[PDB]
Amino acid sequence: ATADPVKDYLKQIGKVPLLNAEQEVELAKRIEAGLFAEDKLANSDKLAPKLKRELEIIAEDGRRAKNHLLEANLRLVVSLAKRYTGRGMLFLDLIQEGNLGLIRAVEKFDYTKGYKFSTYATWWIRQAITRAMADQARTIRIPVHMVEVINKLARVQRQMLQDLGREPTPEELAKELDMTPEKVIEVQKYGREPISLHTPLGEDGDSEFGDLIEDSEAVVPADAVSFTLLQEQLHSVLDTLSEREAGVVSMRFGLTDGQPKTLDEIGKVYGVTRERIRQIESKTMSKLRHPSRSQVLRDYL
Amino acid sequence: FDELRIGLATADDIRQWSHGEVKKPETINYRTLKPEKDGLFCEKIFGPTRDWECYCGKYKRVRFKGIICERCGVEVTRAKVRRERMGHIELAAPVTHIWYFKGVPSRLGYLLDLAPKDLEKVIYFAAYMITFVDEERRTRDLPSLEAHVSVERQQIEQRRDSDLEARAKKLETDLAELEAEGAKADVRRKVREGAEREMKQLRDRAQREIDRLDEVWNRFKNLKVQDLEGDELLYRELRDRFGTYFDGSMGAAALQKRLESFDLDEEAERLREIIRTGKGQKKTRALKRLKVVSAFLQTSNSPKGMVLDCVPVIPPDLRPMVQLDGGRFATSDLNDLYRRVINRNNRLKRLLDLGAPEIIVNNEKRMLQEAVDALFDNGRRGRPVTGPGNRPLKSLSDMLKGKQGRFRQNLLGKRVDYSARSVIVVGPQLKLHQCGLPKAMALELFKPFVMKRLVDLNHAQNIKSAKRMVERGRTVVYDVLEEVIAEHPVLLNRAPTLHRLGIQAFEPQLVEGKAIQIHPLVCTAFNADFDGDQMAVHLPLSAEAQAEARILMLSSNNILKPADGRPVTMPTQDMVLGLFFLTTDSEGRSPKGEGRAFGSSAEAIMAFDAGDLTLQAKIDIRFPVGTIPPRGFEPPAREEGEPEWQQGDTFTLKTTLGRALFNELLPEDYPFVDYEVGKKQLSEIVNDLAERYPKVIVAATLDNLKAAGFFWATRSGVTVAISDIVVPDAKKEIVKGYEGQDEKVQKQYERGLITKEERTQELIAIWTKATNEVAEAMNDNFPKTNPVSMMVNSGARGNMMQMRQIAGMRGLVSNAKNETIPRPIKASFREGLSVLEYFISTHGARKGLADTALRTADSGYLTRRLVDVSQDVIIREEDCGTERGLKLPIATRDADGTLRKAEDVETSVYARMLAEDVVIDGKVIAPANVDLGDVLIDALVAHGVEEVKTRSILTCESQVGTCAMCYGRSLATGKLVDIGEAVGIIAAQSIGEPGTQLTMRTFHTGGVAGDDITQGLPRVVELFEARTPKGVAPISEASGRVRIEETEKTKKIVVTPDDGSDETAFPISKRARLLVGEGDHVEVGQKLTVGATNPHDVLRILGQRAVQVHLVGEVQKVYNSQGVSIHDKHIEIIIRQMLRRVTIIESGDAELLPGELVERTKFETENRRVVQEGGHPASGRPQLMGITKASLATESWLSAASFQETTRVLTDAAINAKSDSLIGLKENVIIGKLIPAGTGLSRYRNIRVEPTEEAKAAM
Ligand SMILES: [Mg+2]
Ligand SMILES: [Zn+2]
Ligand SMILES: [Zn+2]
């Protein structure tokens, strides 16, 4: 228990016996022996108890070889983790994700391949590390295909900067990626990272970047009071009109309820025909359009 | 809002708060820019991003609110719900709360009797815990397991004997066969050597396995709960060699199981037993353990809240991932930390799902623990979670702490609408209660009011058109503005706001230009110069607010500064020079027209314009009837054989026309003044006016004085020129004489006849003498008529040493790091310093600048501490219940055959109420309960009394706070303190204001460190924090025989108290520099050696009265050293606050802990309870502690949390489950409710209003 937990993790690896060829092929042999033992145990057919216990013992020995192999290659997986550090993912995190990849690789390895474990594993370790770096490194989750697109265009752009010694033009980049310029701009804008609010704003201690940008959800009290005055003036003007006329226009424009009702929709509670209610709605529109009840409402827009 | 109960939040409560579960770290889709599902920002759990708008495109209108759509599950409502709703994260493996551990043992509390290293090494997965053992089961089957082990050892030895026999046979066989073979000379010896080496190796492995068996067996016998097993292999061997007996675990799960099975009642009982019979630091440890365990026992919440199971997540709106223009983003670090914890929990769940090794899963649980710890407190262990690497990431606790934390930055000090700011210029033509607001600022501040007035007068058709017209800024808008600002107070307020005169209400007034115009009289109240200075303008909005600004905060009702009760609203920079030039004796000019009389002041003025008379010339002047004459003119009168009353009729008087003008500035009823005004006497007369006249007359008189002062300072003709500053002629001669002496000394130093140090000291003394002599010569030389004399004698501005070093030579200047140069500067600023002289002057100038800056910082900190300890002390009772008073010295240093009043009587006894009457000649002189002024003090001194019994807050016996009469009259008003006034804040501000003004430091260390005591503001803050003084001189315990033992190792002072009491041996430094005689009589109160007395001891032996007097006197002399004065009540309130608590001792019957701080009222209450119950009272001794400790140990946890330290106080508040009652001031400023001090009191706010019946009958 100390600071910088990676150091304690490295000590937790400690000293474990590195595996030479015959050692690990024998371990894989007893691994598959335990595999068949548990396969036989899983079968529903009756087996004598002592044989079943022996099979369980061999399976346990295979599991022990499994943990031996895992502890042996923790060193390799931390090597492949440091190979990917410094890309927005904590190093110990990457180590754990590569360890998951190592568990998968150990579950998919056998001596049937005439090669060492260290060559078969590294592919799966890199697979898990790259997948999880794509899926958990950026604040805004980018889909894996978009991750490979962005990193491909980034690396090739770095290359062309190296050859030309100059910033490539967008069209040259587009023809290099073989996609159109619109996709180039899209991915270029999609491959950014957020900037933290709680950062020094520039002075010694004058708050942070999260105390200088305004919000949009705040109700501008001028707007609210103007809208309320508009509501009052509109309601008074409607009250100026006849009761039925004001009512029908109100339902036509939903001044009592947020959902205005169609012409026929009004002609059920009021008992007027769809064309009749249409007609009186038109006369209301004309009446309110007279210069009389228009001087006040004009100024509210 | 009655109580903010706070306590441990169990897992069930966190589940109850949550409206869902967060299962993903997804935040927002990279393309649609909308929250993802069930991750952070999810609408299904937190709320809809847009008002009433769900996610899936289904129900999308305000009408059908309050329903859940079955497609995405978003509950349509206002978006504001996102600011309230909060979720939670379920952890596969529990973790520990970083707060309650990894801290002081007051919050951790030793709930489990394990050292911090044990916890640090177990909850971070480096060792095991034996959560529970079936020790009874292990003991029951002891013979069987013992016999089994015996058989195991027996067969081990049998097999070992067989192996030894085989080894011997092998050795003999190989030796025999090789000697028979005879391949070489000595084959048998070599093979036998190999055989014995093999035997030795086999013996080595035999003893190794024997040792392992023995160690595992004795660890079997060494089983007990909460036993730590650091070695993992050893723990595994434990598990294999025996199971179903000891149960073990690792990490937070072990702690959870232990706390679940913990029996805190038995621990409390056993710890009480230990405390009953215990010694040493073990007693203190058991005391802390009892405190925490009993705090948990009394409270209903279970201890298992230590180990959280579900982590709440902040509502998304409070950690915004707000969109930014440009395609970029803004993210708060809590998003990163929550992503980290969610990711690690997901990985842990996946690792648990599949059969995984113990190493990987344990390291994963540790990673989860680290992530949660970083979430709550990032940087509390090792390196912080730097995130981007440029800066540590913010964490939850970090937002709740520090200068930038919520408590001090967004709850006590908030930004405010309806305000403005601008540079300030001087406006003389204004009246005392007027301030100028430029057109733009006034128009923008009063936008709602200008709109209302524009619509009401039909200048604008409707409200929106009114907005458009004001934005346009047409003339009618300005006319309406001029109509609307009047009769509406505006509070002008400067940034430092050192004391309550910082915020002052004024009548606004439109004015062209772009800067606030202000009245020069009030500028010195703000300490607001016109070099360049911006002052904020705030607008009272409500009717109550503007009423307050009308009555309370008005610029004309705050003549008197609350610090000591003296005028502060008559500055002196320019006006006082005018008045001084006006009321001046002869010789200011050629006094032409002197020796004549004028029929009235009008004819005198006419003569003055004629030029025959000069303003400064003695003449006889008449006065019309009603002119009250000089106070000393009353006994004299005119000569007649009939009764005459010149106190209020015509009287000629030998004075000057100037004095006539000055007096006719003052009101008619004010007695004539015939003496030069200067600055002191002007303050005197202003105070007299403020005392005996109404406020309006005071303001009008001040305005007349201002106008005349400016006019006559203009006419005064004060200037500065090359010939104005005339260097004294004698200077050169005297200095060269000194130089001769000096060089003579140098000559006799060249021969080695004098040491360099002696030469330096004597030269320093020589030049100090020289500069004193030249200062006196210059003082004699300069006439009284020159401008600098006029503006330094009058008290306008300047100081005599400034003229000394403008005209005479500067003198000795401090060398860097507080040394004195040997060669002082011999040229004054008129002649122009030399190059090295200028350099060595800068050496001191820059040091002065840096010292000034550091002192203002420390003064601000001291002011904050004083205000924060001094709150809660409001006047909440009209009259005390008691009669006890405080003895004060009314008159001291009484010369032979006469009585002389105390030199510093004002700050001590003025503005205090006599507890009881005084009779000296059998007749009552000063009636009880009357504040003291000049007349009564003079009468009592004349009658010859030597001391007085003045009532004061220290003896105040009030069931609720302190009564008004004990505090006596306020000082900013000159009347009895009204009920409910905030005495604590005024006292703290008055204490803190001259902190920047002190700026006093030891001139030179003198080559000795630790001798001279701390000087200046450090001394003040030392006195106020109960710090042991740097130079501490122990105090005599009692009377007896004192003597010195001068041991070679170190000096020592041994005193045997008289009456056979126990001898007491006090240590001392080798350079004691003591003064008490050896083997001599000593008294109780004297101080053994030179130094600064320790307040704790003075309280311990002498008494609380002694320590109160000592602190008051010490801090008062520290302030007076510079020259500032404050009244003693300000100090006394703080002092009573520091002494409030008592340390309990012999806590037998009282049943609580011994040796901890307890409030005085609580002590008296519990003593009354126990004595009523029949049990003898538990003892207590008064204890003095600093303001900081007193403030932290307060009943309102919210107020303390708003103080400097947040995490610890909050932690113990939670563990104690203490509800913060809302009585007091700061916490009621947090909540936004009304402070219970002044207009917020119940008795003032409950009144109802209705006119009389006759008012309605009239109309
Ligand atoms: Mg200034
Ligand atoms: Zn929906
Ligand atoms: Zn009292």
UniProtKB/Swiss-Prot annotation, chain A:
Which of UniProt's keywords are assigned here?
DNA-binding, Sigma factor, Transcription, Transcription regulation
Disulfides per UniProt: none
The segments labelled Sigma-70 factor domain-3 in the record are 148-224
Q: Could you tell me which residues belong to the region Sigma-70 factor domain-2?
A: 69-139
Any single GO BP term? DNA-templated transcription initiation
One GO molecular function term?
sigma factor activity
Residue range(s) of DNA binding per entry: 263-282
Stretches the record annotates as Binds RNA polymerase-binding protein RbpA: 2-138
Location of region: Sigma-70 factor domain-4: 237-290
Q: What cellular-component terms does GO give this entry?
A: cytoplasm
The residues forming the signal peptide are none
Placement of sequence motif Interaction with polymerase core subunit RpoC: 93-96
Q: What domain of life is recorded for the organism?
A: Bacteria
Q: How does it assemble?
A: Homotrimer (Potential). interacts transiently with the RNA polymerase core complex. Interacts with RNA polymerase-binding protein RbpA via its sigma-2 region (residues 211-347) in a free form.
> Briefly, what is this protein's role?
Sigma factors are initiation factors that promote the attachment of RNA polymerase to specific initiation sites and are then released. This sigma factor is the primary sigma factor during exponential growth. Its activity is stimulated by RbpA.
Which family is it part of? Belongs to the sigma-70 factor family.
Protein name in the entry: RNA polymerase principal sigma factor HrdB
Gene source species? Streptomyces coelicolor (strain ATCC BAA-471 / A3(2) / M145)
Whole sequence portion shown: 210 to 510 of 511
Curated annotation (Swiss-Prot), chain B:
Residues annotated for Mg(2+) binding in this entry: D529, D531, D533
Which reaction does this enzyme catalyse, per its entry? RNA(n) + a ribonucleoside 5'-triphosphate = RNA(n+1) + diphosphate
Q: Which InterPro entries match?
A: DNA-dir_RpoC_beta_prime, DNA-dir_RpoC_beta_prime_bact, RNA_pol_asu, RNA_pol_N, RNA_pol_Rpb1_1, RNA_pol_Rpb1_3, RNA_pol_Rpb1_3_sf, RNA_pol_Rpb1_4
Q: Name one GO biological process term.
A: DNA-templated transcription
Question: Where on this chain does Zn(2+) 1 bind?
Answer: C54, C56, C69, C72
Instruction: Please name the Pfam families in this protein's record.
Output: RNA_pol_Rpb1_1 (PF04997), RNA_pol_Rpb1_2 (PF00623), RNA_pol_Rpb1_3 (PF04983), RNA_pol_Rpb1_4 (PF05000), RNA_pol_Rpb1_5 (PF04998)
Q: Which cofactor does it need?
A: Mg(2+); Zn(2+)
- List, in alphabetical order, the Gene Ontology terms for molecular function in this entry: DNA binding; DNA-directed RNA polymerase activity; magnesium ion binding; zinc ion binding
Q: Name one GO cellular component term.
A: DNA-directed RNA polymerase complex
Residue positions annotated to bind Zn(2+) 2 are C880, C956, C963, C966
Q: What is its EC number?
A: 2.7.7.6
Q: How is the cofactor bound?
A: Binds 1 Mg(2+) ion per subunit.
Family under the similarity heading: Belongs to the RNA polymerase beta' chain family.
UniProt subunit comment: The RNAP catalytic core consists of 2 alpha, 1 beta, 1 beta' and 1 omega subunit. When a sigma factor is associated with the core the holoenzyme is formed, which can initiate transcription.
Q: What does this protein do?
A: DNA-dependent RNA polymerase catalyzes the transcription of DNA into RNA using the four ribonucleoside triphosphates as substrates.
Name recorded for this polypeptide: DNA-directed RNA polymerase subunit beta'
Organism of origin: Streptomyces coelicolor (strain ATCC BAA-471 / A3(2) / M145)
Source species taxonomy: Bacteria, Bacillati, Actinomycetota, Actinomycetes, Kitasatosporales
